[PDB]
RNA sequence: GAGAACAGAAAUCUCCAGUAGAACAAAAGGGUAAAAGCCCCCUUGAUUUUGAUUUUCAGUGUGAAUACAAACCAUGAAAGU
RNA sequence: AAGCUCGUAUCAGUUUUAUGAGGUAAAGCGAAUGAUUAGAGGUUCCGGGGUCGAAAUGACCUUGACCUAUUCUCAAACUUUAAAUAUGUAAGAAGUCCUUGUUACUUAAUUGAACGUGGACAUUUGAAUGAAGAGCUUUUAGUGGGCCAUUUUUGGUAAGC
RNA sequence: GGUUGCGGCCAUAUCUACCAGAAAGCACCGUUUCCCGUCCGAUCAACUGUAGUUAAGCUGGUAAGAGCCUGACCGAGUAGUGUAGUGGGUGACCAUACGCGAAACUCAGGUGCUGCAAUCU
């Protein structure tokens, strides 16, 4: 029959690494966790107590609480035609601060630094970010860069 | 040839972390002394370190951080000899007088040597550093060892009852110390105080420094040549442990020298690496030469 | 006894090798890979003839096995016993299977239809595709008429179009010929059963010196 | 050069491997115990064989390790039974050499009535001082090769010393 | 007499009709599941906090 | 791999090599090496009180589990478990 | 269907930027596992045979395994590496920065943790495009036999299976 | 810069064969009266730093070394793949349009960096 366990294929999801096995380093376990870090969900196959669901692997999430070895974390989770709120509780090795957020707070000090530098003189820095513009005109020169003509080439088995 | 591995077993080694391989960090007892509480976020894990080696102790205070372990306070046995101790700095009294020249030294800097003065009579009972009312919750540090192993009378546990008799609140059971009776679960004080002023090596002073003159000569002819008997062995300990609580101040040495001149006199004794154009060079001379048919 | 190859002849199916899953398999009806003078040494046949797959097929062991004695038959009794080396490239490792059915009357009673209907190991076959080697003959340059006669004979044993392609290799290396020609003249080649090990600049110095002596005695 | 790299033994061990577990073990651990002056301890049995007649943790064998100047003592002694020739089969190729005895009736235990006769797996282990790094628990290294002693080595030493000889290899 | 199995088809496309928004996120969020050890010293501590500003704002 | 009386391909003993190519009840897959493996010591934390949460899901039940809170202990020098 | 509260926003079957996760396609086997073609070179106090030997840990020829460097070909339940398309999070005022009040928790320590008091930063206020109004509630119908097409894919020789 | 105590990243740090190492330190190294564990003071418990030795450990260096790490218009815009057509072809399969884009191979480079404290001609 079929065979839905807590643990179903999740063979390659919790394989451990190429050449990582065996005790995991203290960085893990030094961090320090606040009440609305973000977080993300990679699983750490050799510690067994705490683990997370597979719909949980690689999916970022808040954390609300914190506990002696644990960490408890808020999850959106889509099912039906919604987001129900989900709670996981998780240990420090399977959880790792995103990054994600790290950029935006880098940007916010620029983003700051700017405008209360712009003040002074008042040039409308312009703090928003623009996309990739359409690239403007420009002469290309020839000296020792005279153009070499291709043709295609003919057919050959190279067997 | 018979020790000859292959390119597929070494390419899928995974290598001990670094002092796996040396044989000095026994992670996984680490991983259990330096992860805290998570509410405790970054309140220091202290943890009190000595380290075991031949002609010196080494008492250090040791906390945890992700670039590296940090210590505050160091004590070692070879400055002991500043309290008047040039001979024994590897029994289980000089054992003893670091984990309680640490002790004052690292309440020194904290300001708690006006409270907590611990025990100034060496007397032996087994008393954990009691808190003071209103008072600021005594200091906390751990001992980890390492890969030494515990046992009765290990002298290891010199060093924390030389620091519980300063005041540092280690916990500790009183089962492994030196004088601890199996058949009957208790320890007889009196004969651990003697250990705390040499007891073990008390005895063997007198008992042969008359019986065997030839071995006597040999060794413990510092003691001899300084004048050192058997019953001053213990009064010149009682001056450390007044000395220790005298001046923790650990002034520091003058090193003879610079750290510039260490290295520039150091910096000629090395090897260093050959240069990528050199190492082509001496191929292509091994080919002329080996290769060229003489 | 046997279902047409015409049944088997698409890539429909994953890979089914043999494994600790299938334990029971009827063996492969081609053994020999390699006929003609394989002891020969590199450069005594300067010439190699190919034939390839245009289509992405499964050929038969067993149609393998057909195919490789028309080639050598033609090969020994017009070239010489000795004058060139056949190599089947391909190696059947796929598995096929039957549902078995009766085929009397009055089957429809006890045969249960599609219900169950696994089928059983009965045939091998290889898997090809566009452009892959089926048979690799080397030999010398004025045999090139005949073993070009024997892939042609041997082309009539398999399903689909194949090709015949004269190799621009030296033999079965893969060097083109005039690479191999300026290796052979310095050392850089050491002759090997049937193959040859080449120098490289990598490894330790010494051993350079032990083998491939006169490249470095100029 | 060679200040302290001298040849010494490690240890000597002798064994005893019996076939069966009973009443000869008990006396047969007593020639082991006034031999080398100190208790021996069983070897119990890996796994069973049904041929040789050996159970599950059966304690079919005895063997003790003896070290310092009794293990050279007893070396010289025991080697007298062997009139002072040895194969160089004999040595390994790591460097330990041994010899066998039957009938024990030989030395120290001469007859012991009440033992019976028995025989002895002698083994000599050689190293020179520092193989410590080997077996102390911080710092555990490996001893270089010019301190690492070799079949020929030990076979040199062995002329030197008791003025023995080695058989026809 | 067979039917059919399980399929997802269809299910996709009645899920966007009054689709899968994210619900919504509101300030405070709720305190369940917290340590309740943290939870006493925070009602102790918010009561001193609201008493004080009481005398001070009296 | 090299060696030792009976003793050989399989007894017991020694050394060197050895990233798991063993074992950890069973099915298989992950995991695990100063251990999660093998041996020794002590004990019942396989205890007590009700809550929250994950999985399957209707965010029902049942089973399993996760991290906690309030007691009583075991071990260990202790950190801790 | 009835509406309810608000009036362009806590929005979006989309893209961009930044950051994660994955073990498929491919690829690989002179890398682990397993399978698999061919010869070459070596060693047996320790494989089987023929020759010279009473035998030797004596020698010679062959066959089997064993080791070394190669060689041909592979895997749904093999893999070092590893896409494409998909998939989670963020791109602000509920933000950032500064000072200090509470506590029965925590720390050697007014050390921290959470919540607040006071002050500063407003229309380029923090990517794109669009927004047809947005958020919310009650109740109730029918349905709960499905089928086809490109692409992926399993069983089957196949099938309007 | 060396060394030691404690670590961070966990091979650019590993493995094989050699060479060298001044000072200090680590080290090997001596003993069983003392507490402690063993068949065995071998590991270790305990003691001395004195009778000694750099032989090993460790550190550095060497090797057209093995492994490993880094980069490349090196393979290669190749394999693969999203999207399109009343494209081609009996089929198997393939080309084309708008996009994304490997791995093996080849070549070149490298072979630990670093935190706190003490300590060193």
Redesign the interface.
């Known amino acids: 029959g079929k065979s839905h366990g807590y643990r179903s294929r999740t063979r390659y999801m919790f394989q451990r690494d190429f050449?990582?096995?065996?005790?995991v380093?203290?960085?893990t376990?030094?961090?320090?966790?606040?009440v609305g870090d973000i977080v993300d969900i990679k699983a750490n196959g050799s510690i067994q107590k705490g683990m997370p669901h597979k719909f949980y692997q690689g999916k970022t999430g808040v954390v609300?609480?914190?506990?002696?070895?644990?960490?408890?974390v808020?999850i959106?989770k889509?099912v039906?035609?919604?987001?129900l709120?989900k709670?996981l509780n998780l240990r420090?090795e399977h959880i790792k601060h995103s990054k994600c957020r790290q950029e935006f707070l880098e940007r916010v000090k620029a983003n700051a630094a700017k405008r209360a530098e712009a003040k002074a003189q008042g040039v409308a820095v312009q703090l928003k970010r623009q996309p990739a513009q359409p690239r403007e005109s420009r002469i290309v020169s020839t000296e020792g860069n005279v153009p070499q003509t291709l043709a295609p080439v003919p057919y050959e088995?190279?067997? | 040839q018979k020790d000859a591995k292959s390119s597929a077993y070494s390419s899928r080694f995974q290598t001990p972390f670094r002092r796996r391989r040396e044989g000095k960090t026994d992670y996984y007892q680490r991983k259990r002394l330096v992860t805290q509480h998570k509410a405790k976020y970054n309140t220091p894990k202290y943890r009190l370190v000595v380290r075991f080696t031949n002609k010196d102790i080494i008492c250090q205070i040791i906390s945890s951080t992700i670039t590296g372990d940090v210590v505050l306070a160091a004590a070692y046995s070879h400055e002991l000899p500043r309290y008047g101790i040039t001979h024994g700095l590897t029994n289980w009294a000089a054992a003893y007088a670091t984990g309680l020249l640490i002790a004052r030294r690292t309440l020194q800097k904290l300001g708690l040597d006006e409270t907590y003065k611990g025990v100034e009579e060496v007397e032996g009972e087994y008393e954990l550093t009691e808190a003071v009312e209103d008072g600021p919750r005594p200091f906390k540090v751990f001992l980890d060892i390492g890969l030494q192993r515990t046992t009765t009378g290990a002298r290891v546990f010199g060093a924390l009852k030389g620091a519980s008799d300063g005041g540092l609140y280690v916990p500790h059971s009183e089962n492994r110390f030196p004088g601890w009776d199996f058949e009957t679960e208790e320890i007889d004080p009196e004969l651990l105080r003697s250990y705390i002023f040499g007891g073990h090596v008390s005895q063997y002073m007198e008992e042969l420094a008359d019986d065997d003159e030839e071995r006597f000569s040999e060794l413990f002819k510092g003691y001899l040549a300084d004048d050192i008997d058997a019953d001053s062995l213990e009064d010149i300990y009682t001056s450390a442990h007044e000395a220790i609580r005298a001046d923790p101040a650990f002034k520091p040495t003058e090193k003879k020298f610079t750290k510039e001149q260490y290295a520039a006199e150091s910096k000629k004794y090395r090897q260093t690496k050959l240069s990528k154009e050199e190492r082509a060079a001496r191929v292509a001379a091994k080919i002329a030469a080996l290769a060229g048919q003489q | 006894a046997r279902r047409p190859a015409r049944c088997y002849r698409y890539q429909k199916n994953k890979p089914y090798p043999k494994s600790r899953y299938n334990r029971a398999v009827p063996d492969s009806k081609i053994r020999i890979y390699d006929l003609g003078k394989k002891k020969a040494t590199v450069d005594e046949f300067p010439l190699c003839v190919h034939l390839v797959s245009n289509e992405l097929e499964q050929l038969s062991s067993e149609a393998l096995e057909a195919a490789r004695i028309c080639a050598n038959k033609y090969m020994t009794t017009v070239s010489g016993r000795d004058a060139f080396h056949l190599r089947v490239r391909v190696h059947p490792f796929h598995v096929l299977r039957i549902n078995k059915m009766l085929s009397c009357a009055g089957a429809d009673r006890l045969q249960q239809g599609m219900r169950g209907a696994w089928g059983k190991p009965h045939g091998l076959a290889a898997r090809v595709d566009i452009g892959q080697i089926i048979f690799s003959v080397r030999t010398k340059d004025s045999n090139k008429d005949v073993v070009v006669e024997g892939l042609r004979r041997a082309r009539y044993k398999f399903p689909g179009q194949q090709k015949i392609i004269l190799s621009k290799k030296w033999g079965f290396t893969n060097l083109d010929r005039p690479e191999y020609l300026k290796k052979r003249e310095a050392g850089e080649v050491k002759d090997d059963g049937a193959f040859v090990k080449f120098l490289s600049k990598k490894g330790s110095l010494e051993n350079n010196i032990r083998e491939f002596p006169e490249y470095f005695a100029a | 050069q060679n200040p302290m790299r001298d040849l010494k033994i490690e240890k000597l061990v002798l064994n005893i491997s019996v076939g069966e577990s009973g009443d000869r073990l008990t006396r047969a651990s007593k020639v082991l115990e006034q031999l080398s002056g100190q208790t021996p301890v069983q070897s119990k049995a890996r796994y069973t064989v049904r041929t040789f007649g050996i159970r599950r943790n059966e304690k079919i064998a005895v063997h003790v390790t003896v070290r310092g100047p009794k293990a050279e003592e007893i070396l010289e002694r025991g080697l007298k039974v062997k009139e002072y020739q040895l194969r160089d089969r004999n040595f390994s190729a790591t460097g330990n050499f041994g010899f066998g005895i039957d009938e024990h009736i030989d030395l120290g235990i001469k007859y012991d009535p009440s033992i019976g006769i028995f025989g002895m797996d002698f083994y000599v282990v050689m190293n020179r001082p520092g193989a410590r790094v080997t077996r102390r628990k911080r710092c555990k290294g490996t001893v270089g090769n010019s301190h690492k002693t070799t079949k020929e080595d030990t076979v040199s030493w062995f002329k030197q010393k008791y003025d023995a000889d080695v058989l026809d290899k | 007499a067979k039917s059919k199995n399980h399929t997802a088809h269809n299910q996709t496309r009645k899920a966007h009709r009054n689709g899968i928004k994210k619900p919504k996120t509101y300030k405070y969020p709720s305190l369940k599941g917290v340590d309740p050890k943290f939870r006493r010293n925070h009602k102790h501590a918010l009561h001193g906090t609201a008493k004080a500003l009481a005398a001070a704002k009296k």
């Open positions: 050449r990582k096995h065996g005790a380093h203290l960085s376990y030094l961090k320090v966790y606040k609300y609480n914190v506990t002696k070895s644990s960490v408890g808020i959106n889509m039906g035609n919604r987001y709120e709670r420090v088995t190279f067997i």
